[PDB]
Design a protein around this ligand. Structure first.
Ligand SMILES: Nc1ncnc2c1ncn2[C@@H]1O[C@H](COP(=O)(O)OP(=O)(O)NP(=O)(O)O)[C@@H](O)[C@H]1O
Ligand SMILES: Nc1ncnc2c1ncn2[C@@H]1O[C@H](COP(=O)(O)OP(=O)(O)NP(=O)(O)O)[C@@H](O)[C@H]1O
Ligand SMILES: [Mn+2]
Ligand SMILES: [Mn+2]
Ligand SMILES: [Zn+2]
Lengths: 1023, 283, 312, 173, 173
């Protein structure tokens, strides 16, 4: 029968739930006639009503920790543990509140005017599609909320840990269970993990290969969840969230274009998408795809144990249904993409390259059957035996998630003990032993060739070396004429051997609009899309490493538009933009109509061996700094975000509390006790904090149970007698359960994770991602994969340090720029009065590879990943928390320049921030290196500075007084001089910091100032 | 057969040398030398073979086919070279000596560690009783020396004490009574404890700053300053050339290797940083 | 019986495919395998024992026409013995003792087990105390400019041994032993050299524990592939499964055959053994017989020096 | 918590009953849910003397005992000869843990004399004669956990895993 | 033929005495010759009691006891509790094999029965704190082995391997 009654779960709480409760205006009372239920009933003016007997009695009392962190009745009272104030605290920090103010919807009409846009954006959806109305409303609930300048709301004022919507969007997650448990008692946790994503991104020769490999990861994982968001509604996903997802917004308005809909109401949501889910750009319509891969290649689902094919729902019929479903859907998406590619290429039997692609696809189908990217799927079951005392909830049922989630992650960890590579799946023994491989192209004189892009797979398309191509490309089978070589030679450089998979990658890179075969899925035919693409032809320019290395050269030619052009005037560098080619590279996109043709290959003009002397002369005659061949590969991964989703404290104390320290956490009782108690007592807002801290004192030093339940109770009973209409109290059960909660928290040693925790972390991850998207674009960078926690960009070697600093600060919500529509504010993310949380507790590491543009991207990406993996686990730098010099592991920045390495600690504080004060301390060492590089460039210091610190280093690391070392560095600089009457000293927190390493080939100076000067050596070495 | 005969030879630096490695270390030098696994200065076999092959192609242009056969071919490189060089390993480095004793005046001395001699013996043991050319006396000398590992040993001397490289006092002791010199340059050799020997050695290397001057206003250009590292003149390396049995390998060993004293190794040759004298251990 | 391979200098066992300046606007690079594949040792020993009148087809035919059942390679430093150990993307050298509690360690519950294996690969690992990658950048020089050619630059992560290191194989026939004694060979890629010394030894073979250490890449016969990659948990406790190529044959100058394999250092569950024998045809059994003669399916157990083939 | 005991499962049937319990505690050591024997206790370093059963301990960790933590009290007529152990109960090497133990347990373990009266040499043995598999299933496996023949109409999966899920090292001395 | 003895090595100096007279027997198998503590052995499934110095087993290969095999009879006033067994020397799992295998082995093992009373939190610990470790030289390495400091001027490297070649999981309670 028809189901998914979670539209009732999404409007579960009133829009003024913290203004209705703790009334300031109260005018809404006398002009709309329980306190917060007439409000939730007047916001239901579209669809199915409410059932306070089915949803709120159990589910909302399970989605958030607030119920367990308060107690069933005080979390339900609305009236006892009160505070006339209102705040909104971070989830990871309970110190930084937010002034909320109130110019919210205050009237029966100025709120029905929110109902106006809830109407309009839900009036093209008939009841034909029971889902699509919900599938639409779910996303833009927030969009229409914030489009009106209404400040967002805490979860509820007794515990402002959570916000209004994550407490509302984590309702439906548990609602899946509420609906699949009332019937046949099956709940599931589906987890999709992609195997060898790093090695996959590592395979490629050009940046377009990397970019569409990351896009293949994201699209092949978006395909499988297309069905999950189309069947069980949207709220089936926890990681990654979709509250601010570009992929989901794109797919949503495409599904809106389905069924037949005017292009006149789709714009009313497209504006909310371009404005908030994006940051102003509408290039995702002129590109017809989402511009960046954002799907994290590892995803968690909250499923109800149901299915379709009974014309309606039905209890799932197997223990292994979802696994088979998702594996088959994954293979299905892959083969649909490859067949749509075959058809799009057959649509172009001309152009040479497309013709060669056709010619070799038909030879490699039975090899191209296999997907190039295996996935791991693990599930976990839960039934009513585990949740209910046959009529109600249970005690230790609230912890059932924190147990099943941990079981799931445990099996993920165990299965990750064996890595199988996607190449091991193929059958090649006979194809290599017995010459069977299709060798269209040249022919190897050693059996077969290896793919130059892949490295392991044999090569199908072999390209002759650049000595005479046409006289070979034509007598061989590559090309047909002279015109088609220029288009084959346009994508496959001479000498590029290609395996079927990497050749398919090249094919997709030719026009990356075939991705809509996967990006949408389930929605249009595999041929609708090929027709759409062959109709509106659009070419995209993906930048090579040569384009990134030559960024400032291009930039300095466009500020001499004709003053440099008249010199050449002939070689199409300064000639017309012929077509309307656009691209995802924001700097390329914002600088195209500026005189100079940005689509030239620097490997042709100033990186060539027949030219570049002419171009050296041309640049000499114009004050053009001749380009460096180096670019910055900047990678970054979050610190302990796995443990953080597991509610562990290694995110909070990185290096102090090892992950191995959790096996028997009985040892490090002290730091966990300290910080957890701090967080808990600060998580409250109101007189409730007294109750919780005195409970904690009753938990202090194994004090007592059944005894100290009076001092805490002589205030709880005081509070229930402090009102006029209380009904019943079982304080015996309730205060005991309240102490049992914190006792479990401390005994285990981790904040018990509820769905609201996950959706809050995931939403903040996506929002920080939206911030970093425009931070990369602020520094002429090219994103290969920026998804949430991690990042993989390519920037000039010039603004890598600036970007590192500002990115590591914005990850913690500390910045001064507006980054589109998003104006981050000291730990939060302000979006036009909406204060969304951030991750100011999570550290973040950073890898930087200064690479020559001709360096093989395989080893470059592999070195980047291996640094960011080995080093963060393997390095220890001095830190003090609680006033004691301890060690620390994560949250650093490693640099590498063909042999030089350096590490720059990013926090030097283990609760990396705990006050609003320490927000500026983040990346403080980096601005010092930036200032010092600001002095070296302008000719106030000599680079001899970077070769002269060794002599002072002996003295200074054996040195033991502060101001002694102060003067010592001051005079070391003052032999290369910095200034007249010196003004730039090192800030005296940098000394005594000693970096250790667990005996690895990564050699490093044991001190932070020598590492600062090696970072300067590495940055310069690439300029 | 299959490396029948071998030729070990000494690489005596006539000028300073700089076989470069990019910026391949974590020191303050920006153009370091090629480093061993022990951080000592080494010459890779690629560099040694490439330089020697280039030199021989220039100065024996008629023997180009013999040289191609022994050392490889530019194109049609589907014919394995029947000759090979081992990595050149530092055998001895000159050091400035302020000697206190012996009544004999010395101002520089050859210095080694026991790690260096260990690798030299590794090269040497793997040839003699395996191949057929017999120079066991050198191996016996190196074994006699390696016996005393763990104490600064002087060789062929009466020193008993010295300041090395103006910075290190060391107390020496003769080996037994007397021994044939392993080098023929009449200068004492000292084998030092592997810990003070490497400080002395890394103070014997030449680490210079260098400057690019603005050609008109005679000042340094901004950022036109870097560091380089030369192995000092008179330094000695040690390598072996291994020959697979063939006819033109005999031509190599007869016509060519018997007229090779001086070649050019490494780079920065306009500075004059590559001249080398090859002494074969056959005299 | 035992053959110690003593490298005289850094070595290069190339892990990947193409290493040559094919594309003009790009450098080339390479990374060495920590342990040489058994095909390398086999081809070296054959080169030492070459005949000019045999085979010429299916190299392992006339290769095995000279060898015994070579037993997989491990690391001896100074009489000490180290043994590979492999995880997802990880590879660690450990000694005999640290392998004992490994079966029970992987069945410890979540946090205990992860802490255990994580300490096994970052505290007990003795690799970076005895072997480190020595990056060697090389160039070619055009004799017209005496400068570098266009982008003819290459990296090659060599294998530098900080102390004395041997590679240890065991060989059955003794007439082979006293004909390859003291041979200077071209052991590995890009022309590096190693020495061979042979010493007769004694280690037992017939052992069947629950688990095993793969001292060599276990080759999977490509007809058991899908019958293997659906139920990976049944045969390997931890390690890496990878597509490999058997190398490069010298007499015929071709690249050898690509097969799926279980890389050395992976721990296999005894279920593997019969799973191979019961899922291979006699015609493929004849091929894999030779594949084992050269040394590819070698198992040691975590209790003793338990040398064991798989098919044989 | 509870107390569990020490049993080897060879081709021998002499281990029928000295564990006098049929229900025990709310926790259960080995459970069976139509996939075979689960929660197998593995003991490393204790050779067996299968006839005149008294497991003489060895020193070599390359022998094992595929035992079960057999539920209950050691008949309260033994342990003047046995050993016994109250573990923190994380140390027991239990195969394929189905449930979750709260690491609290005590284990009584039979034991024997070192047997210095003949050269020690153990041999590996597996469970032969699947009919004797069935009969040891009868004598010992049935009357300890009686959910077999209760819900189990599937013997092909519960009697043929014990085929080789239990292998040991017998001395025969 | 001779008989050997596997004396424990905890953080404790309860290893000052195990045998009556200095050396006694004819030959020893464990050797200290210039480059390592050869032929040491590691017993598993057990644990050491640093105070009340004896063995206190805890059965899993996760736990292990590292002891040296010396030729002596245990104090002549005990071996009511000291294991005395005999193995064919190839179940003798020796670490760092260097010497000669005897094939007729007899061992004495310092050990007390578990006598379970405490929750045996069995915690490993290094062999370090050089003040503890240096006085051990001529009473654990020259009270039974006069061979060192006779020819050996190589004590600190066979000290380097002392720093690691012993490891266990003690009792602590
Ligand atoms: N959409 C994406 N595109 C590219 N890279 C991604 C994407 N999502 C995640 N990654 C990266 O790929 C890895 C994903 O994690 P993971 O699932 O462990 O793959 P892995 O690194 O290969 N480890 P494993 O799955 O065990 O093989 C991380 O390094 C991410 O930074
Ligand atoms: N619970 C989780 N949910 C979603 N993605 C996760 C989760 N745990 C880890 N990942 C991602 O999967 C990969 C796991 O790599 P890993 O490095 O172990 O994660 P991690 O928590 O960041 N550990 P580390 O980066 O070393 O501090 C990374 O790409 C993570 O972003
Ligand atoms: Mn991370
Ligand atoms: Mn990681
Ligand atoms: Zn490829």
């Amino acid at each position: 029968e028809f189901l998914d009654y979670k539209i009732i779960a999404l409007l579960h709480d009133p829009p003024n739930k913290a203004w209705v409760i703790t009334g300031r205006a109260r005018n809404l009372t006398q002009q709309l006639s329980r306190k917060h239920e007439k409000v939730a009933k007047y916001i239901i003016n579209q669809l199915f009503g409410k059932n306070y007997s089915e949803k709120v009695d159990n589910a909302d009392k399970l989605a958030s920790s607030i119920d367990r962190y308060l107690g069933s009745i005080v979390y339900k009272e609305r009236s006892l543990f009160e505070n006339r104030s209102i705040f909104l605290k971070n989830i990871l920090l309970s110190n930084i509140q937010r002034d909320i103010g109130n110019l919210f919807p205050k009237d029966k009409s100025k709120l029905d005017n929110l109902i106006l846009e809830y109407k309009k954006l839900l009036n093209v959806i008939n009841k034909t599609n029971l889902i699509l109305k919900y599938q639409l409303f779910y996303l833009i609930y927030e969009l229409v909320w914030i489009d009106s300048k209404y400040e967002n709301t805490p979860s509820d004022t007794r515990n402002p840990t959570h916000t209004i919507f994550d407490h509302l969007y984590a309702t439906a997650a548990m609602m899946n269970w509420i609906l699949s448990l009332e019937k046949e008692a099956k709940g599931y946790l589906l987890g999709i993990d992609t195997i060898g994503v790093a090695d996959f991104i590592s395979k490629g020769r050009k940046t377009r290969d990397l970019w569409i490999s990351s896009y293949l990861v994201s699209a092949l994982l978006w395909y499988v969840i297309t069905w999950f968001i189309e069947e069980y509604g949207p709220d089936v996903i926890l990681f990654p969230s979709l509250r601010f997802n570009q992929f989901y917004a794109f797919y949503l308005l495409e599904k809106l274009r389905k069924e037949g809909v005017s292009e006149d109401v789709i714009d009313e949501i497209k504006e909310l998408i371009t404005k908030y889910i994006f940051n102003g750009d509408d290039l995702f319509e002129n590109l017809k795809i989402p511009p960046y891969p954002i799907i994290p290649g590892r995803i968690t689902l909250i499923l109800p144990g149901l299915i379709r094919e009974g014309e309606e729902y039905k209890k799932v019929q197997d223990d292994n249904c979802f696994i088979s479903k998702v594996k088959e859907r994954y293979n299905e998406g892959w083969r649909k993409l490859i067949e749509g590619l075959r058809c799009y290429s057959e649509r172009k039997r001309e152009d040479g390259f497309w013709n060669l692609v056709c010619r070799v696809l038909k030879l490699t189908e039975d090899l191209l059957q296999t997907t190039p990217l295996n996935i791991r799927v693990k599930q976990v079951s839960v039934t009513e035996d585990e949740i209910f005392n046959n009529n109600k909830l249970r005690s230790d049922s609230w912890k059932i998630y924190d147990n099943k989630y941990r079981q799931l992650v445990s099996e993920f960890k165990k299965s990750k003990l064996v890595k199988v590579t996607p190449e091991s799946r193929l059958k090649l023994f006979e194809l290599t032993k017995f010459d069977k491989l299709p060798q269209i192209g040249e022919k190897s004189k050693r059996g077969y060739e290896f793919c130059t892009s892949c490295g392991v797979l044999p090569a199908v398309v072999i390209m002759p070396k650049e000595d005479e191509l046409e006289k070979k490309l034509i007598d061989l089978g590559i090309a047909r004429d002279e015109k088609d070589v220029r288009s084959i030679k346009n994508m496959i450089s001479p000498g590029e051997r290609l395996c079927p998979w990497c050749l398919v990658k090249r094919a997709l890179g030719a026009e990356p609009r075939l991705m809509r075969i996967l990006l949408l899925g389930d929605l249009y035919s595999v041929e609708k899309i090929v027709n759409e693409i062959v109709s509106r032809d659009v070419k995209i320019e993906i930048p090579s490493t040569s384009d990134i290395a030559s960024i400032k050269t291009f930039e300095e030619m466009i500020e001499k538009k004709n003053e440099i052009c008249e010199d050449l005037k002939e070689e199409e560098v300064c000639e017309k933009p012929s077509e309307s080619v656009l691209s995802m590279w924001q700097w390329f996109n914002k600088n195209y109509y500026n005189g100079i043709n940005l689509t030239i290959d620097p490997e042709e003009y100033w990186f060539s061996e027949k030219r570049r002397r002419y171009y050296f002369s041309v640049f000499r005659r114009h004050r053009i700094t001749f380009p460096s061949p180096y670019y910055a590969l900047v990678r970054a991964d979050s610190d302990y975000l796995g443990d953080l989703l597991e509610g562990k404290l290694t995110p909070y104390l990185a290096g102090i509390i090892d992950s191995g320290d959790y096996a028997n956490i009985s040892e490090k009782k002290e730091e966990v006790n300290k910080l957890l108690e701090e967080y808990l007592v600060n998580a409250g807002s109101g007189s409730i904090v007294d109750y919780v801290k005195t409970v904690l004192k009753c938990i202090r030093e194994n004090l007592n149970k059944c005894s100290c339940a009076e001092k805490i109770y002589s205030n709880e009973v005081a509070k229930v007698m402090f009102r006029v209409n209380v009904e019943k109290a079982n304080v015996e059960e309730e205060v005991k359960n309240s102490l049992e909660y914190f006792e479990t928290i401390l005994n285990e040693g981790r904040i018990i994770v509820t769905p609201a925790w996950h959706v809050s972390i995931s939403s903040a991850l996506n929002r920080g991602l939206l911030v970093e998207l425009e931070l990369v674009n602020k520094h002429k960078g090219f994103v290969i994969y920026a998804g949430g926690d991690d990042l993989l960009a390519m920037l000039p070697v010039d603004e890598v340090l600036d970007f590192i600093k500002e990115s590591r600060r914005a990850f913690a919500g500390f910045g001064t720029e507006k980054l589109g529509n998003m104006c981050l504010e000291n730990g939060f993310v302000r979006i036009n009065n909406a204060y969304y949380p951030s991750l100011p507790i999570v550290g973040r590491s950073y890898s930087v590879i200064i690479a020559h543009y001709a360096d093989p991207l395989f080893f470059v990406i592999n070195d980047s990943y291996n640094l960011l993996e080995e080093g963060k686990e393997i390095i220890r730098y001095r830190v003090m928390y609680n006033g004691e010099y301890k060690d620390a592991k994560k949250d650093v920045a490693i640099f590498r320049y063909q042999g030089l390495t350096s590490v720059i600690p990013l926090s030097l504080k283990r609760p990396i921030v705990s006050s609003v004060s320490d927000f500026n301390e983040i990346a403080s060492i980096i601005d010092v290196i930036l200032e010092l590089k600001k002095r070296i460039d302008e000719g106030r210091i000599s680079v001899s500075l970077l070769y002269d610190y060794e002599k002072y280093k002996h003295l200074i690391v054996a040195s033991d007084e502060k101001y002694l070392t102060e003067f010592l560095v001051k005079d070391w600089i003052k032999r290369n001089s910095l200034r007249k009457h010196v003004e730039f000293t090192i800030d005296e927190k940098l000394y005594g910091v000693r970096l250790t390493i667990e005996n690895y080939p990564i050699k490093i100076p044991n001190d932070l100032i020598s590492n600062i000067v090696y970072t300067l050596r590495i940055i310069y070495g690439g300029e | 057969p299959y490396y029948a005969f071998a030729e070990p030879f000494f690489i005596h630096a006539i000028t300073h040398l700089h076989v470069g490695s990019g910026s391949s270390v974590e020191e303050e030098i920006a153009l370091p030398f090629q480093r061993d696994e022990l951080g000592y200065p080494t010459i890779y076999a690629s560099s040694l073979k490439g330089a020697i092959k280039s030199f021989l192609l220039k100065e024996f242009p008629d023997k180009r086919d013999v040289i191609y056969k022994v050392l490889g071919e530019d194109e049609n490189p589907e014919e394995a070279s029947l000759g090979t060089f081992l990595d050149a390993i530092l055998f001895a480095i000159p050091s400035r000596i302020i000697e206190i004793d012996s009544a004999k005046p010395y101002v520089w001395v050859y210095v080694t560690t026991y790690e260096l001699l260990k690798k030299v013996k590794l090269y040497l043991d793997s040839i003699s009783q395996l191949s057929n050319a017999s120079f066991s006396n050198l191996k016996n000398k190196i074994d006699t020396i390696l016996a005393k590992e763990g104490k600064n040993i002087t060789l062929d001397s009466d020193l008993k004490s010295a300041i090395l490289n103006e910075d290190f006092y060391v107390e020496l002791e003769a080996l037994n009574n007397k021994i044939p010199s392993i080098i023929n340059a009449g200068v004492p050799l000292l084998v030092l404890e592997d810990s003070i020997g490497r400080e002395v050695i890394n103070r014997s290397l030449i680490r210079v700053r260098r400057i690019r001057i603005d050609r008109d206003k005679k000042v340094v250009e901004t950022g036109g300053l870097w560091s380089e590292e030369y192995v000092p003149m008179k330094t000695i390396f040690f390598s072996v050339l291994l020959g697979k049995e063939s006819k033109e390998s005999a031509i190599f060993a007869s016509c060519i290797l018997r007229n090779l004293r001086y070649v050019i190794l490494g780079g920065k040759e306009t500075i004059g940083k590559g001249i080398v004298e090859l002494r074969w251990v056959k005299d | 019986k035992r053959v110690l391979i003593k490298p005289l200098e850094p070595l290069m066992f190339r892990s990947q495919g193409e290493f040559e300046p094919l594309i003009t606007g790009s450098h080339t690079a390479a990374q060495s395998l920590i342990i040489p594949r058994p095909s390398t040792i086999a081809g070296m020993l054959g080169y030492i024992l070459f005949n000019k009148s045999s085979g010429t087809g299916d190299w392992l035919s006339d290769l095995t026409n000279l060898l015994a059942t070579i037993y997989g390679t491990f690391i001896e430093t100074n009489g000490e013995y180290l043994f590979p150990l492999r995880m997802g993307n990880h590879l660690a050298l450990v000694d005999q003792q640290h392998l004992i509690n490994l079966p029970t360690l992987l069945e410890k519950e979540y946090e205990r087990r992860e802490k255990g294996i994580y300490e096994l690969f970052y505290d007990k690992n003795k690799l970076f105390q005895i072997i480190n990658h020595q990056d060697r950048i090389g160039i070619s020089i055009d004799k017209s400019t005496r400068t570098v050619k266009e982008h003819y630059l290459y990296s090659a992560r060599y294998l530098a041994f900080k102390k004395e290191v041997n590679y240890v194989i065991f060989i059955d026939n003794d007439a082979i032993s006293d004909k390859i004694n003291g041979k200077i060979v071209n052991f590995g890629g890009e022309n590096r050299i190693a020495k061979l010394e042979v010493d007769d030894y004694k280690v037992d073979t017939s052992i069947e524990e629950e688990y095993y250490l793969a001292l060599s890449p276990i080759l999977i016969p490509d007809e058991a592939l899908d019958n293997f990659l659906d139920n990976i948990s049944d045969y390997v406790a931890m390690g890496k499964v990878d597509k490999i190529s058997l190398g490069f044959d010298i007499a015929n100058t071709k690249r050898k055959e690509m097969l799926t394999a279980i890389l050395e250092g992976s721990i296999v569950k005894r279920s593997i053994i019969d799973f191979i024998k019961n899922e291979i045809k006699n015609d493929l059994r004849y091929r894999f017989s030779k594949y084992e003669k050269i040394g590819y399916n070698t198992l040691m157990s975590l209790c003793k020096l338990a040398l064991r083939k798989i098919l044989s | 918590s509870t107390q569990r005991e020490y049993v080897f499962i060879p081709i021998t049937n002499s281990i029928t009953i000295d564990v006098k319990i049929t229900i025990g505690g709310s926790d259960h050591i080995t459970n069976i849910d139509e996939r075979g024997i689960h929660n197998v206790l593995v003991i490393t370093g204790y050779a067996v003397d299968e006839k005149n059963g008294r497991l003489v301990p060895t020193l070599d960790p390359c022998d094992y005992v595929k035992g079960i933590l057999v539920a209950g009290t050691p008949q309260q007529a033994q342990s003047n000869d046995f050993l016994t152990l109250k573990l923190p109960a994380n140390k027991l090497y239990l195969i394929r843990k189905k449930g979750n133990i709260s690491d609290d347990l005590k284990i009584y373990i039979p034991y024997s004399s070192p047997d210095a009266r003949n050269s020690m040499k153990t041999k590996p043995v597996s469970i032969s004669d699947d009919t004797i598999v069935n009969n040891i299933i009868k004598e010992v496996f049935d009357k300890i956990y009686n959910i077999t023949q209760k819900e189990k109409v599937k013997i092909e999966k519960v009697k043929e895993d014990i085929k080789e899920l239990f292998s040991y090292y017998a001395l025969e001395q």
